[model samples]
Target: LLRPGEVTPGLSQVEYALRRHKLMSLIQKETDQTVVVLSNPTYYMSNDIPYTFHQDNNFLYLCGFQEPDSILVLQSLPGKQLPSHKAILFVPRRDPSRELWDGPRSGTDGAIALTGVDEAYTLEEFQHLLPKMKAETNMVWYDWMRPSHAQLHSDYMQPLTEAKAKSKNKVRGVQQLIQRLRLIKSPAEIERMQIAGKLTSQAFIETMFTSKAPVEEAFLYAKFEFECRARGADILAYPPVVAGGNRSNTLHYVKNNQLIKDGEMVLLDGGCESSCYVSDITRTWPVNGRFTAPQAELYEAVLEIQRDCLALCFPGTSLENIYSMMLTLIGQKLKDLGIMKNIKENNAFKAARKYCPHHVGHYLGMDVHDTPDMPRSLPLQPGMVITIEPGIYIPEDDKDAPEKFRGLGVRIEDDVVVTQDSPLILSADCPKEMNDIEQIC
Candidate 1:
């Protein structure tokens, strides 16, 4: 039903089962069900497009089955003979008419065998059974996104909400639990993330070294996409930002249509997603060859802050503490460069805005911004993956900005994993040092 690739299919089905077990463990009652639900977002608002559908990350985490028009439910049914079932994956049954245009269907039978789940059922089976399930159960552990996937349950979850009204039924959300689990990734997940980082680093180096400068932004953007795809990564973690000159000041610039001038710095904020794990990296350097004096000054300032930040990425440290250090170091550097007038506490925040406007870093994983529920104030732990991105941007429109530094912008970013001693650099192969960046380009 969607673009097909088992990024990890046939690779291993064991981890899927282990995750489902852990999910079940979170439920206190052996009778209670811990249901994780997900529905694929529309390929586009309109028009029928093929190869655009992607399985929701939540669904992929629990079950490896990735075709669309599918619903998966995990339960430990109690008080019945051999009633224990690890999972129930509902899929569209084989339909020749729909399959003619939509391509092959993974029907009920194949889904069970493929995912190694205990049971499999067709959509008709799930719809009829799900309503009865809600009616019967008292404590339901779920955030079930069933309505969006109305193909299976057309009656809507309205009755399920009403179901709670009758019995001592309590609807519990497992979102917070799942988010916390996702924040500290497993070894399997870490391997996937590392592979994504390796592929992404190669794409960046190849794109910069082989492509000509003074090229259109889309050219570099396309180059990265092509290189990543060639290496088997099918999606980028986020929209690639190939902005140049003052366009870089726009921050999340993705128009990618403007021509990158020879002297303009190209902010190549890009990375690839592989095996459902994501990596992020942003590198800014001269489009033609070497950075000009003003560009180099801003780049070096950003780089220094990033390097110092990297050194402090130990397990006990917190991101808030790291951000404070970033501001202190960056403000000091900017003041020395004559960019900031003074380093007063209030002025430091304002001065931080003058250069780096975004958060100093963010958690990175399945989604570019992963584990939304995990607060940044939480202390860093051994398995947490994060980004260290520090930048400086001086738009030409800034009236107070010095003329020499106007239109100059630079950002250096890398994916890092916290460890007992030193932080592990996932995207370390791609050069960030000034000497290496110059020579590589």
Candidate 2:
């Protein structure tokens, strides 16, 4: 049963309705239109073994319906003007045979009652809307390039799109417009993110405490996953990087099978999904619970750079601006550490990239890299959430690097929220300080 005004636990039906209202408002700026978004289809891992079903982010953002093989449509009403439209859902039909094993499927009436949409129908009935969509005056907004549900697209949308291609008005992609709406977090969205961030922070502390000498990277990965799930996280946002020692220098090193030596450091870049929001946090710590002199120097440098980058997360500053700042800071730190000698200003930036390959961070929220289509060049607004991660890697094979610092990598990351007065650190509860991390370990 739905709560008084909420569909999900924390999210309200009104909020989802407001999102549809806002999308319609955006459409009014253009012309009369029909917006269509398809839910993801369930895929099997083997013959009949199904992978965990995940709804399309765009589709969920608008309606909060979690089922697969569904479609959401926002269509302009006959006599109503723009910004005054009807919301409809085409969901999977209920089947007692499938429900026995797959659990219950929210049928037509359930979909309407749960999502607060104006109308609901079975998935097959979507074909009846094809003729209306093919009309010359109707401009359907659908993401034709990268359809979320390929089967639905081929079976229903592709034919409509092809027919529209021959008409005066054509089908336009709506992903960007929906992305624009998702870029800024509402108050409720921030609350869900706060819960995710806090729980993930606590999980980091637990994982750090479990770190010990000569431990398996896979063991740590399992420990981290357990902690997050124990704290009520639905799942790990993505495959975590439990890289040890030299492997830490390799970005996206998720093959966590190697054994870490006693003195080596382990870099864990992990996060958890709570509700629909997620957190992406990275921390490097010595498995032995104490940092060596060389490791200390690099770790301290990265922490300072990350903190500085976090301070730059306030409104009006673009992520690109902070990335430029990060490169400049990393160059100065490298020169100070005697890693890069006689570096000219222009060469220093290039040297920075050589040592630290990736950008400082990316947007973070429902998806780890949330709002993928939203450009980083856009100035940050109050509701925007982002990650501030900075790292420096010195591979063991590099001849130019000092022997003491070789095979060492350090990265400090935190989830940040852009606000009016100051930026908020979502992962602040996680320890990054040498003393705090060592104390916990």
Q: Model 1 residue 215 lDDT?
A: 84
What lDDT would each prediction earn against the true structure? 0.77, 0.90
Model 2 agreement with the true structure over 1-441: per-residue lDDT tens digits: 345878765789889999999988887776457999999999889988999988899999999999999999999998779888899999878889988978899879989888899999998899888888898878799998889999999998999998888888899888888888888898888888999989999998998998899999999999999999999998899999999999999998999999999999999999999888899999999999999999999999999999889889988999999999999999989888888876784274888998899988888878998888788899999999999998999999987778888899998889988888798888889999999999999
**Worst lDDT 10-window in candidate 1:** 1-10
For each candidate, give its TM-score against the true structure. 0.90, 0.97
As a whole number from 0 to 100, the lDDT of residue 238 in candidate 1 is: 83
Q: Which has the greatest lDDT?
A: 2
Q: Over 4 Å off in model 1, which ranges?
A: 1-11, 29-31, 34-36, 41-47, 79-85, 144-156, 165-170, 345-348
Model 2 spans with C-alpha error above 4 angstroms: 1-3, 345-348
